[PDB]
Design an enzyme around this catalytic site. Structure first.
Site, short mmCIF file in Angstrom:
data_model
loop_
_atom_site.label_atom_id
_atom_site.label_comp_id
_atom_site.label_asym_id
_atom_site.label_seq_id
_atom_site.Cartn_x
_atom_site.Cartn_y
_atom_site.Cartn_z
N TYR C 332 0.83 -1.19 0.00
CA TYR C 332 0.00 0.00 0.00
C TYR C 332 0.88 1.26 0.00
CZ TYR C 332 -4.63 -2.18 1.04
OH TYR C 332 -5.87 -2.77 0.96
N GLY C 444 -13.15 -0.20 2.51
CA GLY C 444 -13.24 0.97 3.32
C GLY C 444 -12.40 2.16 2.92
N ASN C 480 -7.45 4.75 7.68
CA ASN C 480 -7.26 4.02 6.43
C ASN C 480 -5.97 4.31 5.69
OD1 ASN C 480 -10.67 4.80 6.36
ND2 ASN C 480 -9.93 2.70 6.65
#
Ligand code: F43
Ligand code: F43
Ligand SMILES: C[C@@H](OP(=O)(O)O)[C@H](NC(=O)CCCCCCS)C(=O)O
Ligand SMILES: C[C@@H](OP(=O)(O)O)[C@H](NC(=O)CCCCCCS)C(=O)O
Ligand SMILES: O=S(=O)(O)CCS
Ligand SMILES: [Cl-]
Ligand SMILES: [K+]
Ligand SMILES: [Mg+2]
Ligand SMILES: [Mg+2]
Ligand SMILES: [Mg+2]
Ligand SMILES: [Mg+2]
Ligand SMILES: [Mg+2]
Ligand SMILES: [Mg+2]
Ligand SMILES: [Mg+2]
Ligand SMILES: [Mg+2]
Ligand SMILES: [Mg+2]
Ligand SMILES: [Mg+2]
Ligand SMILES: [Mg+2]
Ligand code: NA
Lengths: 442, 248, 548, 442
Positions: C332, C444, C480
């Site tokens: 990520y 999400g 997040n």
């Protein structure tokens, strides 16, 4: 009344106001002036319009040394303070002519704001005061100058700081005597998280008024905490009365008798004499050239001892005109009186213990600071249940200029706004008047 | 209802998937038993497990909202909530993740739809899930090369296709057979082998994929050229922005 | 010239980057990978030694049915498997965090006022130097007053020290230069003048406590440790009684009144003290990164060095460990600092802006947001469409969303010179992306995305804040991946385009301009590469006090 | 008076109660039933006497799996509940005829306690409710059985748990709907930190009453937070009215029309039609076979859309009789309606965003849980300013038993006590009646 006790009430000059008032007329739960003080502290906010203006002009927002180059906004807030304050008031109030107050001070540099009581009646806690005030002034400033969508977030930062990235209103240009609910050491502690310097500032360093405000706040917290429920209630009420409200003129008279040449020790001797004279204590037995005293009313002994503790602080720190030794007075008044009498000291050792750590944390490298930065929510000074911090307030009122972190340094915005409010500044006056007014309904 | 702005085939296909009056093209026939096998929640002939007693057996107090809302059949029965999950290739699969969730909450009752880049899921009562899943598997929601039924190990939406035109599958649940030109499902959606594979038909050819797809790409119809669709997205951005500031 | 990611794509795959088809399932699973092979063998050894099974490639699903890719660390020629960019496996990444966690800035302004008033003693460069010699003995954990003290081993705490800085050149030059962060030496002329004007005659300490202590303890230790040894050193150097009433003023000053934490404490659901990652606002993170003072002629480089700093810290260490854990969130984050992809997209946007408006010359309004963020978003998405290898590289929609929107947001801020319109461009990018591909990120991902447009310009209590002041505890941002480090980049972007010396706090900027740090904050991506290669030397190890 | 809007108010069976009620008659700042509910929730405590007794008998105090061998105390608390409760009441009340209530339930196994309102009038916040209740019952138990000085600290541990070593009352055998002030995500959040399952429990799973209680609490918090001050006030009031109070029977009628066969999409179509019919929206522009809608009243569009969102949850989660899909409804109602109309969704995207993260954190490994454990203070579900959580309450009311962490699991003590209180159980009834009563005073 639950209790049989009556007290004589005096003013801050030592003159009689009302005789034989039921003790519970002074209770936070019954006294309308204490209610008005507490609700006033919940609802009052100091707004620094000058500070907001300067933060905007320089883009210095979000906390110490912070600045966003290119974000400067040059708005004539102080010059338009009247209009901005009126517009804010229209948003803060619930109805026209309710108990909302918005008053300019210092040529428009500051505003006193009292958020209407009706907002707190339907609130869980007290944060509506800063939050409603902040958004009303943010919106009023935006509307006054037609600040654009692109720029308005700077006005928000100038008013309330780095919140919500920070938990606190970090860099805000509003102030309250209360602090945020997350900083409470325990549930029920909010009226304890009020800096001693703020109390001294609000009461203009009037020694008895500072002691009274501090005692009112501390003992009212003891009710919210549940400490003053059931078996303990009378102890707390007697402590409020005798230590913070000069009941029976005992604090005043001990100071009068010891002020010229006295010491902590001479105040102790006088208090023990007075307790004996009044039948609060009696000789229980004789050791070798030593009398062991007992009492049939520990809460009243505690209250007399607490009055003497206050007087001892006024005599010791008043003679020095230097607050630092309050930590010593709080310790050794209690230590000495136990070995003088064979009775327990104020708050059954908890003032003495508070004083040990307070002494350490006001004369060492590890934490704390000068007396004025402490409060009943401070980890060092939370331990006594209302019987220590008011003495610290008295001591700081008597300080002639020995502190770096003085009320002038820490509490100037609070002073300018909160000292305007008569009930905050002279609480002993209003609480005694209210007690007299309700004496035949208790 | 309008469903979606735009003047491309993509936009029309997005509208068609959402519109419950649009008849989804049926491309393949699958038996009831094979849908149950693909789902993998129970064995054929196994009674529906329950999560609570039938609604009839409960002693519920008066509630006007309950009274007005007809429960789906599996809710009446007390069925478990189970799922079916699909992965769609960015190389012109007919359905795509938000297309599915938007369509599902227009077409299906009692639906818990979730969208992610590499997987899209619906959860609902088991017997109702089986009926919905038949439609999801038999119609143009599904292509057996460019879409996959996958309850785990979903990687592939963004991968290059293999030499057969099949999407990557770490667990190889769908196998292209050259000898029929047809795809067989050889494992259920969680990856356990099926005793007997399920025929899923032939992959759609390139021309038909392009007719049916709901993804915008430079080598298909580009989103930037569907200027009316872009206009509405930009409008929503601006109106949200203004509203958050001052309700204008 | 080739797109900046083409070399990396050619290194990863045998096919050309444009090719749409490949073959899978023939690589031997994990056996294709040097690193997985190392891990399989290590797991066998670990399990045999301890008597409990551990790493086993046959648990769960079989990695490596596709190519397990190398990644180019952007701006370097280093190619590594992604496991070498996991923070657990990368000592450079760990040390970057330790160097932040173990730092606080502590004024000497109140302290010197206490000295001159309350103690009635003079302060000069000479007395300051004596104090600094004293505190550099004491700070690592050594004694100055009491008899029979026992002390830290100097070699275990060699990374702990105190320096100072001041905007007054003549005062700075009179203090022994071993202790001074020299603003004129570390910053280019225009930046130095800005920074010196911010500091003025103020004098500030930069205190670094030992890494071994920070690792044993927590971030909230830092300001306390600092203050204890400042306190002892004030007693020793200025010849105080060793514990009198004035002592408490030095404590309060050093612990509260003139301390600047790197991070503020967090609310209870995510309870943490000071100097933890969630408390570090985006503007501070940009200022900690030192790319601004080296790469100032290239605002893209400066901005993307900040993105790398933040993607690693905020997504890998903070969200991927402090707030979750396990395998975590390496890729990520790597999406934002590998394969020169974000670089390609952001240089495209900067050039677009330069040509249409000129940097910092666009109107600061929604018209500019719509123009720039849309154009840059469409460029980035087109690259994934044009290059199937690129799409297979950045395989998770979240990664793509973060990269495309970071380019769009930075580019918008390059145009306007304002971070808030940059932020609006980030959210518009997400909305366009979602409609273009009928997908965005993970389940999400766009919580903050959908709240985003409305909260950019809000002024309400827990909504309204300039981007520079936002951080990982801004409510919408608290959960997040694929946002926080990118926001630090957007915060940097307009300031880099403007040539500003700092983004949010000039003291923080100066405090990391220091080659005595262990990690080199001027070249964050180079350091991540060094760590990946197992070539970085961290502080804090216990080798000296354990068996050979 | 400040706003011209009027609404028609109905009961939970869809029958008209009062037409043409001024909007501000529903305001938390004006409506006396909202005040009564909020003050009631501040002051009410559930006491588990059986739980206290069992903790003592086993010495299982201080939190999960904790026990102190040798400390067991076997006291007949439930058998002496009447005496204990009466003794506690004497300490809890301020005066004998005040609004203190102490009522035994379950054969003395439980007590409903409502701490007198006067204690909160002189308190900063709400912690006096658990703290005064706890100490009154600790003292009453000690006094009932003459528990020794040596043993009494076990009674304290059994009642209030590991506090103050823990910040929370960890292992306590009392419960409140509120949680401690330190757990607030921001100042002003306390009425948001009320578990959805607690709301559903108190309203006995009546869908409209659960939605109403949740909306009352959420939107009252928006006033305490300052969000409903100034420019935003009307938006929040219209949201309270249309989403939580079934104003104009709009929620009810949408559910009626869509309950038999409908979907989220069919509810959207009906709501857009109704907004157009009522003149809330109008066609602004024609694209190719697509109408772009506009509005001259964004707050009213938002309110209509919010009513549709509630109805969509009732239709979707009601059809499944399974709450989990509320996270999906909250997302796709809003996503779909934006592309259906060209207008912004409820709370300008903030419901949709809340829903994205709520979906994730109720279907993943990382945190969250089932719908019933969320609340307006939860980090996942705080973002929308009152327009999301009431839908979650409705969905959980409609759940027929699909949840592990159900209200039966999490909220049984709350249910037994708080559902006894008429205004908590049936708030829509009392708030509508109060609005009708004050309609001509606005
Ligand atoms: C079990 C979940 C649900 C959940 O709560 N977390 C998971 C799994 C979790 C695990 C996976 C580790 C493992 O395999 O044992 C970890 C590493 C977190 C951890 N516990 O350490 C993780 N995800 Ni996930 N997860 C990721 C991602 C994703 C992408 C992958 C899409 C694809 O096509 O491959 C999708 C969401 C989406 O579709 O957008 C996703 C889903 C999921 N994510 C699905 C499993 C998907 C599957 O069955 O294959 N992650 C990514 O998009 C990229 C980064 C990647 C993370 C690891 C890293 O950053 O290096 C990892 C982050
Ligand atoms: C400056 C203070 C005031 C203060 O806030 N902390 C000090 C000093 C501080 C420093 C001393 C390190 C140094 O020398 O640089 C440290 C180690 C804390 C730190 N900053 O790391 C410490 N004390 Ni102290 N401090 C101690 C103690 C003590 C005893 C020592 C009495 C004796 O006769 O020697 C007395 C208090 C007392 O009288 O009871 C004491 C005082 C004091 N303590 C007086 C200095 C006394 C002096 O001038 O000699 N410590 C102890 O009693 C034993 C443990 C010892 C600690 C170190 C360890 O635990 O190994 C140390 C703990
Ligand atoms: C008092 C308080 O310090 P402050 O007054 O808040 O600066 C507190 N320190 C301590 O309690 C220090 C304890 C360890 C050193 C003294 C050991 S006797 C703390 O840092 O939170
Ligand atoms: C939601 C909340 O979890 P709880 O619902 O409190 O269990 C919170 N976790 C997170 O926000 C996880 C963030 C990192 C993993 C997801 C990255 S997208 C926390 O642990 O405090
Ligand atoms: O699949 S989920 O989006 O829940 C998690 C992605 S790491
Ligand atoms: Cl350069
Ligand atoms: K650590
Ligand atoms: Mg007299
Ligand atoms: Mg005498
Ligand atoms: Mg059939
Ligand atoms: Mg073309
Ligand atoms: Mg190659
Ligand atoms: Mg084995
Ligand atoms: Mg010289
Ligand atoms: Mg040097
Ligand atoms: Mg170096
Ligand atoms: Mg006894
Ligand atoms: Mg037409
Ligand atoms: Na495996």
């Amino acid at each position: 009344a639950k209790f049989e006790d009556k007290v004589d009430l005096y003013d801050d000059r030592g003159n009689l106001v009302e005789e034989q008032v039921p003790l519970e007329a002074l209770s936070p739960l019954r006294n309308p002036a204490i209610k008005s003080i507490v609700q006033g502290i919940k609802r009052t906010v100091a707004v620094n319009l000058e500070g907001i203006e300067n933060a905007l002009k320089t883009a210095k927002v979000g906390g110490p040394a912070c600045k966003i180059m290119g974000r400067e906004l040059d708005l004539d807030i102080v010059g338009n303070a009247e209009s901005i304050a009126a517009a804010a008031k229209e948003m803060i109030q619930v109805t026209e002519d309710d108990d909302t107050n918005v008053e300019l001070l210092g040529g428009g540099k500051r505003a006193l704001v009292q958020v209407p009581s009706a907002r707190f009646d339907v609130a869980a806690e007290y944060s509506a005061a800063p939050l409603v005030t902040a958004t009303a002034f943010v919106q009023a400033i935006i509307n006054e100058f037609d600040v654009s969508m692109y720029d308005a977030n700077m006005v928000k930062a100038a008013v309330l700081g780095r919140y919500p990235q920070s938990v606190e209103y970090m860099g805000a240009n509003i102030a309250t005597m209360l602090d945020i609910p997350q900083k409470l050491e325990g549930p029920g502690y909010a009226l304890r998280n009020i800096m001693v310097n703020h109390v001294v500032a609000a009461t203009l360093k009037n020694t008895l008024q500072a002691a009274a405000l501090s005692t009112i706040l501390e003992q009212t917290a003891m009710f919210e905490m549940g400490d003053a429920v059931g078996a303990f209630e009378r102890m707390h009420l007697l402590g409020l009365a005798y230590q913070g409200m000069n009941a029976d003129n005992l604090v005043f008279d001990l100071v009068k008798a010891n002020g010229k040449e006295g010491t902590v020790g001479s105040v102790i001797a006088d208090l023990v004499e007075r307790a004996l004279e009044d039948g609060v204590i009696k000789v229980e037995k004789e050791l070798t050239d030593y009398k062991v005293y007992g009492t049939d009313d520990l809460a009243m002994w505690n209250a007399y001892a607490a009055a003497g503790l206050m007087a001892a602080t006024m005599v010791n720190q008043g003679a020095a005109r230097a607050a630092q030794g309050v930590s010593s007075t709080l310790l050794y008044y209690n230590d000495l009186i136990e070995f003088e009498t064979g009775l327990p000291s104020v708050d059954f050792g908890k003032v003495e213990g508070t004083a040990v750590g307070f002494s350490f944390f006001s004369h060492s490298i590890y934490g704390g600071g000068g007396p004025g930065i402490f409060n009943g929510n401070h980890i060092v000074t939370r331990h006594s249940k209302g019987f220590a911090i008011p003495c610290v307030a008295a001591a700081m009122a008597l300080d002639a200029g020995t502190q770096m972190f003085s009320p002038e340094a820490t509490s100037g915005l609070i002073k300018e706004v909160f000292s305007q409010v008569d009930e905050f500044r002279e609480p002993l006056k209003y609480v005694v008047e209210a007690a007299a007014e309700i004496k035949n309904e208790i | 209802a309008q469903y979606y702005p735009g003047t491309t085939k993509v936009a029309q296909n997005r509208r068609n998937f959402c519109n419950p009056e649009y008849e989804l093209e049926k491309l393949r026939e699958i038996s009831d038993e094979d849908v149950v096998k693909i789902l993998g929640h129970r064995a054929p002939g196994e009674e529906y497990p329950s999560v609570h007693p039938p609604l009839e057996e409960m002693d519920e107090p008066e509630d006007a909202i309950r009274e007005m809302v007809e429960p789906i059949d599996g809710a009446k029965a007390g069925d478990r909530v189970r799922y079916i999950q699909f992965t769609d290739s960015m190389y012109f699969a007919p359905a795509q993740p938000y297309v599915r969730s938007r369509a599902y909450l227009c077409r299906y009752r009692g639906a818990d739809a979730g969208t992610l880049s590499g997987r899209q899921i619906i959860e609902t009562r088991e017997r109702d899930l089986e009926k919905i899943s038949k439609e999801l598997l038999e119609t143009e929601f599904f292509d057996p090369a460019r879409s996959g039924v996958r309850g785990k190990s979903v990687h592939g939406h963004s991968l290059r296709l293999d030499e057969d035109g099949m999407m990557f599958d770490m667990l190889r649940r769908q196998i292209y057979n050259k000898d029929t030109g047809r795809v067989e499902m050889v494992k259920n959606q969680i990856g356990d082998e099926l005793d007997e594979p399920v025929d899923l038909g032939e992959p759609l050819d390139e021309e038909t994929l392009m007719e049916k797809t709901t993804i915008y790409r430079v080598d298909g119809e580009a989103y930037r050229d569907d200027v009316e669709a872009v206009e509405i997205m930009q409008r929503i951005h601006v109106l949200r922005s203004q509203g958050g500031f001052n309700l204008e | 010239a080739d797109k900046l990611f083409i070399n990396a794509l050619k290194k990863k795959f045998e096919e050309s980057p444009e090719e749409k088809k490949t073959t899978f399932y023939t690589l031997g699973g994990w056996k294709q990978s040097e690193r997985k092979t190392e891990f399989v063998n290590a797991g066998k050894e670990v399990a045999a030694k301890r008597g409990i099974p551990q790493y086993n490639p046959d648990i769960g699903t079989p990695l490596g049915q596709r190519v397990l890719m190398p990644y180019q660390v952007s701006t370097t020629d280093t190619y590594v498997e992604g496991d070498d960019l996991h923070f657990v496996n990368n000592a450079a990444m760990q040390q970057m965090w330790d160097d932040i966690r173990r730092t606080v800035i502590v004024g000497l302004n109140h302290a010197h006022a206490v000295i001159e008033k309350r103690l009635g003693k003079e302060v000069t460069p000479e007395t300051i130097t004596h104090y600094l010699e004293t505190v550099n003995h004491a700070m690592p954990g050594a004694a100055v007053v009491q008899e029979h003290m026992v002390e830290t081993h100097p070699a275990l705490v060699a990374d702990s020290y105190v320096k100072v800085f001041t905007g007054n050149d003549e005062i700075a030059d009179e203090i022994d230069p071993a202790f001074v962060i020299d603003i004129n030496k570390q910053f280019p002329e225009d930046q130095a003048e800005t920074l010196k004007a911010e500091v003025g005659d103020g004098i500030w300490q930069v205190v670094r406590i030992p890494t071994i202590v920070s690792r044993t303890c927590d971030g909230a230790t830092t300001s306390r440790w600092s203050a204890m040894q400042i306190g002892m050193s004030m007693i020793s150097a200025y010849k105080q009684a060793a514990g009198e009433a004035a002592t408490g003023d030095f404590a309060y000053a050093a612990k509260h009144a003139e301390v600047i934490h790197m991070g503020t404490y967090l609310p209870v659901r995510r309870a943490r003290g000071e100097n933890e990652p969630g408390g570090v606002p985006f503007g501070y993170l940009a200022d900690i990164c030192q790319s601004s003072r080296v790469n100032y002629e290239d605002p893209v480089r400066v901005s993307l060095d900040v993105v790398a700093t933040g993607a690693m810290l905020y997504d890998q260490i903070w969200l991927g460990s402090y707030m979750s854990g396990g395998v975590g969130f390496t890729q990520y984050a790597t999406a934002a600092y590998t394969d020169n992809i974000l670089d390609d997209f952001t240089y495209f946007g900067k050039e677009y802006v330069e040509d249409k408006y000129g940097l910092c010359e666009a109107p600061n309004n929604m018209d500019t947001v719509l123009d720039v963020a849309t154009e840059v978003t469409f460029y980035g998405l087109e690259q994934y469409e044009e290059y199937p290898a690129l799409l297979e590289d950045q395989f998770g929609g979240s990664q793509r969303a973060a990269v495309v929107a970071a380019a769009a947001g930075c580019s918008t801020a390059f145009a306007t010179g304002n971070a808030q319109t940059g932020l609006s461009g980030w959210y518009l990018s997400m909305y366009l992306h979602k409609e273009q591909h009928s997908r965005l990120g993970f389940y999400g991902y766009d919580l903050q995305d959908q709240c985003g447009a409305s909260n950019v310009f809000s002024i309400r209590g827990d909504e309204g804040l300039p981007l520079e002041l936002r951080g990982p505890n801004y409510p919408n941002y608290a959960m997040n991946v694929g946002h926080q480090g990118e926001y630090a980049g957007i915060s940097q972007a307009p300031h880099a385009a403007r040539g500003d010396a700092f983004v949010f706090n000039p003291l923080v900027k100066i405090a990391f301009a220091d080659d005595n740090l262990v990690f080199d904050f001027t070249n964050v991506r180079g350091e991540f590469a060094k760590g990946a290669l197992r070539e970085f030397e961290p502080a804090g190890e216990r080798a000296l006090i354990t068996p050979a």
